Symmetry: C2
Subunit: 82 residues, 2 copies
């Protein structure tokens, strides 16, 4: 689907609420994720260490992983209707 | 699905590739989007005026709209799956 708008015809902005999500691009081999068997390639993360990770910058997500002294918590989504 | 990792071994890290996506939280009434009838609540935007916005920061998305002075052509990913 292609979305085409015209910010000239009418004197007004697009007025569209833009947001962002977080997911796992991939997983490294011989890592904690591979051993844990929880994080999968393409997994969508919503919370980390008991904190929401929506509308945040990709950089911030990296920090949450650094803040973790030992145990890292990550809440991902699985149910998406069928 | 709750993911819980436990970092202990010095030669063993999480090794999880983190990424981010972009979507539309909502659309303002009497706006270009509503008038055009292309953008919908929950639309996952991949590109903007010929520029991919994946793995970027929510802030950058705000800038893209600022530079888009005129017609905005974005590409959303859909498959009749809600």
């Amino acid at each position: 689907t292609k979305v085409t708008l015209v910010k000239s015809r009418k004197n007004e902005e697009y007025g569209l609420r833009l947001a962002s999500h977080i997911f796992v691009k991939e997983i490294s081999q011989d890592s904690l994720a591979a051993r844990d068997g929880n994080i999968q390639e393409g997994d969508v993360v919503l919370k980390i260490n008991g904190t929401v990770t929506e509308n945040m910058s990709l950089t911030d997500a990296k920090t949450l992983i650094e803040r973790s002294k030992g145990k890292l918590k990550m809440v991902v989504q699985r149910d998406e209707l069928e």
